[PDB]
Structures are given as C-alpha cells and as structure tokens.
Structure 1
Amino acid sequence: SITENTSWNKEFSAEAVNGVFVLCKSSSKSCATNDLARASKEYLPASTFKIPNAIIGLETGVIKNEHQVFKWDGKPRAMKQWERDLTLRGAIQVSAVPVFQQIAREVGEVRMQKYLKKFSYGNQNISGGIDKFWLEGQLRISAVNQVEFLESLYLNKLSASKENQLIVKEALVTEAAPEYLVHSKTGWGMGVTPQVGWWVGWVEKETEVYFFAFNMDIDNESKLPLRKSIPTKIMESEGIIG
C-alpha cells in the first residue's frame, strides 16, 4: 500500500519544515510518503473538518442546498474576510469558522458522533464542545486517513447521498486548467501546539486521479504558504500538476 521516499525531504529542508506528504495514484492502495511514521500520526484537522461538516450539514438538512446563503448579522468576526454574506462554497473557501460553528450546533453531538463513525474520521473524538472540537478539542486525523476519506468522497462512497457528495465536491474546486482540475482544502490549527498546517485534496489530469494530503508544523504565520508550495512542487515534478 505505501512506500517511503526520503528524497522528498529535500523539499522540506531549505525551509526547515517538519511535515509529511502522502500522494496516491488512482486509489489509497498505491501511496508514497516522505515519512511513514508521520503519515499515520493524527493531528487536529482545523478547517479541513469543513469537508465532513458540510456533508453532514447537508445530510441532516441543516444546510438546505448548495445555494443557501449564510448571512452576516453585523456582529464583528475574527477575520475581515468573514464579515459578508457567503454561499456554501464561499464559506468553505474563506474557511469561515463561525458559519460552521453554527452548522455544528444544529447538527448536534449525537448526530455528529454517528457521522464521524460512518465516515471513519480519525479518532472520532468530538469532546471539547460541539462548536469547537476540530479547532481546539480532541479530534485528530492522520494524512493517510484524510486520503482514504477523500477517495471515498471522490467515488461517492461515503454514507451520504450522491447529491450531497457532489455538492461538496463542487465547493472544493480550487484550480481549473485546461489539462487538469484541483479540489482542495487548507487548514491551520492555531489552538494546538505546535500548530498544524494542512493541504489536502485531489487532482484529475487527463484520465488519471491523484489523492494527496500534506501537513506540517507552523510556528509563525509567514510559513503558511509552504503548506501549498511544498506539495505543489512535488506534484509538478511528477507531472501531476502542470
């Protein structure tokens, strides 16, 4: 299933990054990683949790459909970018925390618990408060588990309607090129130490698909772009992006 490639550490070393990339062609049955140990280590998901949360919001009817607008009430928010009305896609792409905290409260503990068991999502630990377990609570998931989850979503194999999986997939499109299409999601777990940065998703190029998950320790905000640039450089050297 999974082969170690220590040459990739070259990409990590200039910037002194502690991190892991997991990359799979076609299925999670043929993966490579730079670090087998860290590939299976579980970290706080932070905003990557918007993926299952959005699917569960749709499945339970908490989110009406892909056209639902989440209105800003006028109360100040942690980020300038969140202080506007947002569509589902917008809320996911600008990683609007308070929109998803309200979704989580309306889903509720009992249903949230069940859905993470159906999705086999990490340690499935949602203690710490219904509106903050993926931000500062006990939930943890590995890069390998992120790839397995995303593969299921890609194939419409999660326990959820095909419709709701498709809706969330469109919301995850981040790069459209004539040769290839990227679905992806960032995360930055600030409420854990060391802080974790994520980039997870998949790339379709020609008739093939590649699933990936990247995470790294982030001390300082100036290192955030490395969570996309390190794995993009690896994917581009293999011809997956470009």
Structure 2
Amino acid sequence: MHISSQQHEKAIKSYFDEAQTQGVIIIKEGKNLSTYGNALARANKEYVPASTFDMLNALIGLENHKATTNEIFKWDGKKRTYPMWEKDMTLGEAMALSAVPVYQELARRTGLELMQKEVKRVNFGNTNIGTQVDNFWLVGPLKITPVQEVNFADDLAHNRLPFKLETQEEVKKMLLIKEVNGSKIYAKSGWGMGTPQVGWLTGWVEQANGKKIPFSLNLEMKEGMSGSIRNEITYKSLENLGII
C-alpha cells in the first residue's frame, strides 16, 4: 500500500533494464490499464502475435469441432527444430510446449476461409491473416498491440469472447503455468525468432478471492536470451505490485 508509484515504476523498469531488453508489461485492474517497463511507447505498437495466437487457434478449432480436448495429434515422425515436439500430444500439451506443428495442423483443419472469418469475428489485432493458413501468426501479416493482447486476455479470463462458455473454459484449462500462494497464473508465451525478435507473455492472475488481473508482457528478445526471462520479469513485476 505504502510503496510510491515512482518506486513501483522504477522497480519494474529495472527488471527490463537488468534483462538487457526493451519492453513493457501492461496490467489491467478492472477497466484501468497501467503500462510499466523500460520502453513504454511499445504499448500501442503492432507486433506479430507469434505463439500467443495458439489461444485463439485453440478456441476456433474447438468451437468449430476441428478437435476435441482429449484428441491425440500424432507426431508425423519428421525431425523438429525442438526435439520435445517429437511426440504425440493433445492441444493442451501443445499449448504448454508451444508445439507449433500441432497448431499448424489445427489451423489447416480449420482452413483459410473459416480462419479469416473467425479472426474477423473476434476482432483480433489487425484481423488480417493473408493467404497462408499455417504461418500467418508467426511471419505476418497478422499483428497486434500489447494493449490489444491484454484486452484479449481480459475477454478470455471473463468468458467475454464470442465463443461458447465451454470452449473458453476448455482453453483456459490449457493455460495454467504457475501457482504462487493461492494465486494461479494463466498465460501463453510467444517468441518471434528469425530481428527485431518479439517476445510475449500474455495472460491473467486469478487471485484467491476470484479477482482476475490480466497482463501482457511484450519485449525485444535477442539471440542468447533464455525464454524464461519473460516469466521472470512478469513474476517480479506482478510481485512488486502485490498482485501475487
């Protein structure tokens, strides 16, 4: 309570500074959006969503009966960039591992025409998926701002997106990444590799009392960084604000 806003802002900036990155973290409490970090002007800039799009890919695929939550997506036997992708998995496992080939298969099942209609219907980011159904979230043309990502997280956390309640609950169950005291953190990461590289961690804290506090971390990744810096800055920021 007694910590100054000047102190909170300095502390959260220092987490991005110490990571040798440029970034923001947007926190929403009710309808109020607060922008913190060491590069505040990133808040209304467009970036590819990268693997954060898996949240909406999963919602679209489940709602349109392109998969079930127990369905096992078989590994095709081909070598992957990541050896942990060389296995058969559900959408939920794919969400935790960020197994791009599973979300590419799901996107192909949905198909371009339905995917473009659904992305337009949800009003996600710039809403433009272009002509390639299996990589539009990774290389463009789809883009989104950190403000738009925190607002998407707020919509999903409160079941406000235009999908069935059951569809939204199914995808939320796939996004639990941490429990701290009685808090649960739901989030999806992204890393647009191949300069400048974008890193994301977008989600919400569900506090003990039931309050949901959405957030979106957006930062420049560089060759040599650990992906876990996204988690570390996010957790330090939320702890600094007493959200966790």
Q: TM-score under structure 2 normalisation?
A: 0.90
Matched with 1:195 is: 197
Structure 1 position 221, deviation (Å)? 3.6
The answer on 1:86 being equivalent to 2:89 is yes
The answer on 1:98 being equivalent to 2:89 is no
Instruction: List per-residue Cα deviations over 1:76-123 (Å, max 9, x = no partner).
Output: 222101001112210111011111111111111111111112221111
Q: Map 1:75-154 onto structure 2 (within 5 A).
A: 75-127=78-130, 129-154=132-157
Whether contact under 8 Å (2:23, 2:40) holds in the other structure is: no
Matched with 2:43 is: 39
Deviating above 3 A after TM superposition, structure 1's stretches of 4 or more consecutive aligned residues are 3-6
C-alpha distance in structure 2 between counterparts of 1:154 and 1:222, whole Å: 29
Whether contact under 8 Å (2:199, 2:218) holds in the other structure is: yes
Q: TM-score under structure 1 normalisation?
A: 0.91
The answer on 1:48 being equivalent to 2:52 is yes
- 98-107 vs 221-230, which moves further: 221-230
The answer on 1:20 being equivalent to 2:24 is yes
Cα 1:124/1:209, change in 2 over 3 Å: same
The answer on 1:70 being equivalent to 2:82 is no
Whether contact under 8 Å (1:129, 1:137) holds in the other structure is: no
SS of 1:48 mapped into structure 2: helix
Whether contact under 8 Å (2:116, 2:129) holds in the other structure is: yes
Structure 1 position 66, deviation (Å)? 1.3
C-alpha distance in structure 2 between counterparts of 1:10 and 1:221, whole Å: 20
Amino acid at match of 1:141: I
Matched with 2:212 is: 209
Whether contact under 8 Å (1:128, 1:137) holds in the other structure is: no
Q: Map 1:153-164 onto structure 2 (within 5 A).
A: 153-164=156-167
C-alpha distance in structure 1 between counterparts of 2:227 and 2:99, whole Å: 17
User: Any stretches of 5+ residues in structure 2 without a counterpart?
Assistant: none
Amino acid at match of 2:101: P
Instruction: List per-residue Cα deviations over 1:165-212 (Å, max 9, x = no partner).
Output: 000000011113451111011110013x20111111100112222110
SS of 1:42 mapped into structure 2: coil
Matched with 1:57 is: 61
Cα 1:221/1:125, change in 2 over 3 Å: farther
C-alpha distance in structure 2 between counterparts of 1:77 and 1:118, whole Å: 33
Whether contact under 8 Å (2:23, 2:219) holds in the other structure is: yes
Cα 1:161/1:109, change in 2 over 3 Å: same
User: Any stretches of 5+ residues in structure 1 without a counterpart?
Assistant: none
SS of 2:202 mapped into structure 1: strand
Whether contact under 8 Å (2:150, 2:216) holds in the other structure is: yes
SS of 1:99 mapped into structure 2: helix
Q: Map 1:175-194 onto structure 2 (within 5 A).
A: 175-191=178-194, 193-194=195-196
Aligned residues: 235
